[PDB]
Amino acid sequence: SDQRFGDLVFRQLAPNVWQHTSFMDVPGFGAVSSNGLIVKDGERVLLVDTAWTDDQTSQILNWIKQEINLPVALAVVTHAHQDKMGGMGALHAEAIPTYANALSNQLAPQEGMTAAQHSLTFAANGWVDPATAPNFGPLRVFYPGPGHTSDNITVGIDGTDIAFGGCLIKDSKAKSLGNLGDADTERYAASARAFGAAFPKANTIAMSHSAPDSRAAITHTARMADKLRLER
Ligand SMILES: [Zn+2]
Ligand SMILES: [Zn+2]
Numbered sequence: 001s002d003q004r005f006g007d008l009v010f011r012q013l014a015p016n017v018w019q020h021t022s023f024m025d026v027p028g029f030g031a032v033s034s035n036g037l038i039v040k041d042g043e044r045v046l047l048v049d050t051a052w053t054d055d056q057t058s059q060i061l062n063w064i065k066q067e068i069n070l071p072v073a074l075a076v077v078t079h080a081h082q083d084k085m086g087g088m089g090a091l092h093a094e095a096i097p098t099y100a101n102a103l104s105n106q107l108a109p110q111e112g113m114t115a116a117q118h119s120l121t122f123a124a125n126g127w128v129d130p131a132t133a134p135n136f137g138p139l140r141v142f143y144p145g146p147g148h149t150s151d152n153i154t155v156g157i158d159g160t161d162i163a164f165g166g167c168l169i170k171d172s173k174a175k176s177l178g179n180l181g182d183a184d185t186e187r188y189a190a191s192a193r194a195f196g197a198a199f200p201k202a203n204t205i206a207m208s209h210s211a212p213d214s215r216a217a218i219t220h221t222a223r224m225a226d227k228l229r230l231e232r
Contacts, residue, residue, distance in 0.1 A: 057087020
């Protein structure tokens with residue numbers, strides 16, 4: 001099912017939903033992959049994350065024009081890390097409206113990243129403000145709280161069984177919580193469970209550093225963060 005296109009891999013998770021995977025050689029971590037989503041919303045395309053680099057992101061757009069042949073109406077990025085906003089200049093070069101958490105845009109220059117042109121705000125219940133996320137269609141953006149970072153957001157797709165956890169959620173067989181450098185060890189547990197409650201009917205949990213998994217990935221991440229909470 002994994003379709004190869006250039007330096008990336010593409011997999012169809014559902015009708016109108018695809019997963020794009022880019023690879024990067026972290027020096028002390030081997031060849032680490034990162035996943036994003038491509039959503040066909042009627043006559044337009046919605047992108048849920050970029051690749052590691054500008055070059056890999058332009059390969060994503062070339063795949064969209066090749067396979068779907070529809071304009072990319074908007075692009076959301078889940079937090080300010082290389083695997084998520086590394087291809088921001090590639091999306092801005094094609095005049096694609098980019099959206100991110102307001103904190104992610106404040107943090108992007110601190111890590112050498114191009115901030116998104118629009119900033120998302122959120123209500124007290126973690127859901128995105130409709131004034132900041134216009135015409136998102138099926139995209140349901142949810143802020144579960146500080147976890148993997150302090151700005152990580154999640155996205156769900158209506159009409160589908162799919163909810164995207166980004167780097168907050170790891171697969172049910174993960175032996176660790178991944179990159180904990182920018183993590184909130186206290187709220188990670190409650191944030192992982194908040195993401196599971198925001199999308200209760202989503203049994204296909206997609207994430208950045210793992211293949212799509214069931215909802216056991218949510219509880220396994222929460223239990224892992226439960227022990228991380230008491231170790232700090
Ligand atoms: Zn990250
Ligand atoms: Zn990541």
